[PDB]
Design a protein around this motif. Structure first.
Motif, mmCIF file in Angstrom:
data_model
loop_
_atom_site.group_PDB
_atom_site.id
_atom_site.type_symbol
_atom_site.label_atom_id
_atom_site.label_comp_id
_atom_site.label_asym_id
_atom_site.label_seq_id
_atom_site.Cartn_x
_atom_site.Cartn_y
_atom_site.Cartn_z
ATOM 1 N N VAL A 235 1.091 -1.273 -0.108
ATOM 2 C CA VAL A 235 -0.107 -0.165 0.164
ATOM 3 C C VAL A 235 0.969 1.635 0.057
ATOM 4 N N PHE A 236 0.467 1.890 -0.836
ATOM 5 C CA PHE A 236 1.960 3.340 -0.933
ATOM 6 C C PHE A 236 0.374 4.593 -0.425
ATOM 7 N N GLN A 237 1.045 5.678 -0.271
ATOM 8 C CA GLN A 237 0.180 6.674 -0.149
ATOM 9 C C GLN A 237 -1.231 6.832 -1.075
ATOM 10 N N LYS A 238 -1.993 8.067 -0.192
ATOM 11 C CA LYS A 238 -2.920 8.031 -1.135
ATOM 12 C C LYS A 238 -3.267 9.072 -2.001
ATOM 13 N N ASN A 239 -2.349 9.685 -2.063
ATOM 14 C CA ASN A 239 -1.778 11.088 -3.257
ATOM 15 C C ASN A 239 -1.251 9.946 -4.090
ATOM 16 N N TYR A 240 -1.065 9.585 -4.414
ATOM 17 C CA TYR A 240 -0.063 8.315 -5.413
ATOM 18 C C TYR A 240 0.862 9.255 -6.349
ATOM 19 N N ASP A 241 0.119 10.230 -6.688
ATOM 20 C CA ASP A 241 0.919 10.665 -7.671
ATOM 21 C C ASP A 241 1.791 11.988 -8.250
ATOM 22 N N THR A 242 2.338 12.111 -6.848
ATOM 23 C CA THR A 242 3.374 13.323 -6.210
ATOM 24 C C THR A 242 4.608 12.829 -5.918
ATOM 25 N N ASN A 243 4.645 11.509 -5.930
ATOM 26 C CA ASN A 243 5.752 10.670 -6.038
ATOM 27 C C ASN A 243 6.571 11.478 -7.247
ATOM 28 N N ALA A 244 7.392 11.886 -7.002
ATOM 29 C CA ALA A 244 8.537 11.474 -8.059
ATOM 30 C C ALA A 244 9.216 10.538 -8.883
ATOM 31 N N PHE A 245 9.710 10.297 -7.660
ATOM 32 C CA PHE A 245 11.205 9.088 -7.397
ATOM 33 C C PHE A 245 10.003 8.242 -9.029
ATOM 34 N N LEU A 246 8.754 7.433 -8.461
ATOM 35 C CA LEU A 246 8.186 6.468 -9.390
ATOM 36 C C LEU A 246 7.494 7.697 -10.244
ATOM 37 N N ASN A 247 7.535 8.593 -10.772
ATOM 38 C CA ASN A 247 7.065 9.384 -11.586
ATOM 39 C C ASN A 247 8.690 9.105 -12.788
ATOM 40 N N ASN A 248 9.525 9.231 -12.311
ATOM 41 C CA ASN A 248 10.543 8.951 -13.382
ATOM 42 C C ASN A 248 10.302 7.379 -13.465
ATOM 43 N N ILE A 249 10.354 6.650 -12.522
ATOM 44 C CA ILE A 249 10.081 4.746 -12.520
ATOM 45 C C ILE A 249 9.067 5.279 -14.410
ATOM 46 N N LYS A 250 7.883 6.389 -13.529
ATOM 47 C CA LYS A 250 6.979 5.505 -14.530
ATOM 48 C C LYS A 250 7.016 6.700 -16.108
ATOM 49 N N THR A 251 8.007 7.079 -16.277
ATOM 50 C CA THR A 251 8.128 8.214 -17.739
ATOM 51 C C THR A 251 9.696 6.577 -18.247
ATOM 52 N N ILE A 252 10.163 6.493 -17.606
ATOM 53 C CA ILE A 252 10.980 4.976 -18.349
ATOM 54 C C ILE A 252 9.681 3.677 -18.768
ATOM 55 N N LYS A 253 9.062 3.290 -17.624
ATOM 56 C CA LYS A 253 8.588 2.532 -18.539
ATOM 57 C C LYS A 253 7.796 3.116 -19.796
ATOM 58 N N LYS A 254 7.195 4.395 -20.011
ATOM 59 C CA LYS A 254 6.761 4.875 -20.970
ATOM 60 C C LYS A 254 7.132 5.142 -22.389
ATOM 61 N N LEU A 255 8.688 5.767 -22.340
ATOM 62 C CA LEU A 255 9.457 5.631 -23.496
ATOM 63 C C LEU A 255 10.396 4.135 -23.374
ATOM 64 N N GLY A 256 9.868 2.841 -22.496
ATOM 65 C CA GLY A 256 10.492 2.093 -23.062
ATOM 66 C C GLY A 256 11.838 1.326 -23.031
ATOM 67 N N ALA A 257 12.577 2.476 -22.489
ATOM 68 C CA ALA A 257 13.263 2.256 -22.044
ATOM 69 C C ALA A 257 14.708 3.043 -21.204
ATOM 70 N N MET A 258 16.084 2.909 -20.703
ATOM 71 C CA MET A 258 16.672 3.967 -20.345
ATOM 72 C C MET A 258 17.789 3.468 -20.281
ATOM 73 N N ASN A 259 18.939 4.731 -20.180
ATOM 74 C CA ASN A 259 20.278 4.418 -20.325
ATOM 75 C C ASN A 259 20.548 3.943 -19.682
ATOM 76 N N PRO A 260 22.156 3.353 -19.717
ATOM 77 C CA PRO A 260 22.825 2.558 -18.625
ATOM 78 C C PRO A 260 23.258 3.885 -16.900
ATOM 79 N N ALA A 261 22.926 4.857 -17.428
ATOM 80 C CA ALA A 261 22.957 6.530 -16.019
ATOM 81 C C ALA A 261 22.252 5.409 -15.371
ATOM 82 N N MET A 262 21.685 5.349 -15.986
ATOM 83 C CA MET A 262 19.645 5.272 -15.457
ATOM 84 C C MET A 262 19.554 3.702 -14.284
ATOM 85 N N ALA A 263 19.680 3.027 -15.695
ATOM 86 C CA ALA A 263 20.494 1.833 -14.723
ATOM 87 C C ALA A 263 20.690 1.425 -13.867
#
Length: 374
Positions: A235-263
């Motif tokens: 279970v995460f926080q009720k305002n699930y969309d304010t988290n920058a860390f998981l937002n970058n995870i969601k970008t990497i998921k939609k971009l389909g990839a990440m450079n190895p500095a990200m990995a």
């Protein structure tokens, strides 16, 4: 940096020098007693509240505003229901005392004069990395000063500030004046980068808290890190969309990839229910044990994170600096030491669970009920 640099830190640093293993191991522990909890409606606060009820015997006073709700008692029950399946209404009025107030109004503490508080846990804070006004300093600095002033109306009230590892923000901007600089539980100031308003605010709350210690107040500063979903059930926080860390995870998921500095980027996954357990254990440590780095020490990488994401079939791949740099346009921390807190926590029977694959799937399962990745 006028208010920051024009300050003599000699007293504070002399206290910080008492924050050693020998002084924890030989020191006399503190009792939690009755707690005054600020921030009880936030992600961290509401789990401190849960852990307190599940494993301590005292009362806990929760300062909050009634808001749209009728009574502040009803608002609190709505938040607990939102986060835990257990119904806790029966304890309200006996072990959970709701209190109308806001830590920015010093008068909102006067009603507590006659109540028996032993410990203030201040988890109320405004965490907004970009803000164009100065209300962040009201909540994060003035709300602390107001709580410290309440605590100082007595001689038997601890103050426990929830801070952030981010106050250790950078290498020194003045290596000349700060040689051989360490970044651990005995460090506060070394002319790090404090240009960021949120970091500057938490820095000034810590300085206020330790300044109060030089005047006799028993205090603790618990620096937390990446507050992530519960270990028990994701279970995460009720305002699930304010988290920058998981937002970058969601970008990497939609971009389909990440450079190895990200990995390669390593992160703590401080599971919120274990942060709460840790806050309550470190609050009992001896008085000379003042600063803690309370974050999951088993770091993981974004390789580990996307490996767990790829069990959903997203096919996130690790491209190269060139390959990645093309798919986009189409649309110091290692030096920070936390070993002393890990050792103290271990001695208190606390070990950080690993953010393993099965936990990451618990975490992503919950996110997926909000179509977070759709």
């Amino acid at each position: 940096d006028d208010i920051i640099k024009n300050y003599n830190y000699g007293e504070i640093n002399e206290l910080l020098q008492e924050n050693t293993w020998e002084n924890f191991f030989d020191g006399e522990n503190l009792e939690l007693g009755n707690v005054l909890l600020t921030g009880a409606t936030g992600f961290l606060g509401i789990h401190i509240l849960y852990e307190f009820i599940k494993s301590e015997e005292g009362k806990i006073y929760c300062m909050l505003r009634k808001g749209k709700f009728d009574s502040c008692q009803e608002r609190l029950i709505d938040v607990m229901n939102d986060y835990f399946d257990e119904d806790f209404t029966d304890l309200v009025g006996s072990r959970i005392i709701p209190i109308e107030g806001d830590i920015t109004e010093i008068d909102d503490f006067k009603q507590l004069e006659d109540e028996p508080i032993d410990t203030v846990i201040n988890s109320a804070a405004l965490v907004k990395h970009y803000t164009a006004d100065d209300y962040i300093f009201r909540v994060n600095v003035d709300g602390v000063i107001n709580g410290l002033k309440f605590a100082q109306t007595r001689n038997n009230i601890k103050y426990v500030q929830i801070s952030t590892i981010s106050v250790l923000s950078s290498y020194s901007l003045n290596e000349e004046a700060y040689p051989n600089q360490e970044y651990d539980e005995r460090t506060l100031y070394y002319e790090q980068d404090l240009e960021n308003k949120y970091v500057c605010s938490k820095f000034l709350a810590e300085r206020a808290v330790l300044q109060a210690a030089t005047k006799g107040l028993p205090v603790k500063i618990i620096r937390v890190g990446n507050l992530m979903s519960r270990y028990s059930d994701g279970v995460f926080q009720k305002n699930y969309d304010t988290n920058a860390f998981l937002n970058n995870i969601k970008t990497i998921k939609k971009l389909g990839a990440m450079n190895p500095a990200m990995a390669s980027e390593k992160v703590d996954m401080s599971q919120i229910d274990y942060v709460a357990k840790g806050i309550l254990a470190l609050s009992k440590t001896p008085e000379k044990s003042r600063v803690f780095h309370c974050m999951n020490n088993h770091y993981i990488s974004h390789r580990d994170i996307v490996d767990a994401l790829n069990t959903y079939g997203y096919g996130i791949e690790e491209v190269d600096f060139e390959e990645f740099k093309q798919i986009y346009e189409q649309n110091f921390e290692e030096n920070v030491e936390i070993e002393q807190t890990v050792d103290i926590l271990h001695s208190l029977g606390f070990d950080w669970p690993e953010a393993d694959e099965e936990y990451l799937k618990r975490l992503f399962d919950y996110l997926n009920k909000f179509d977070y990745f759709e």
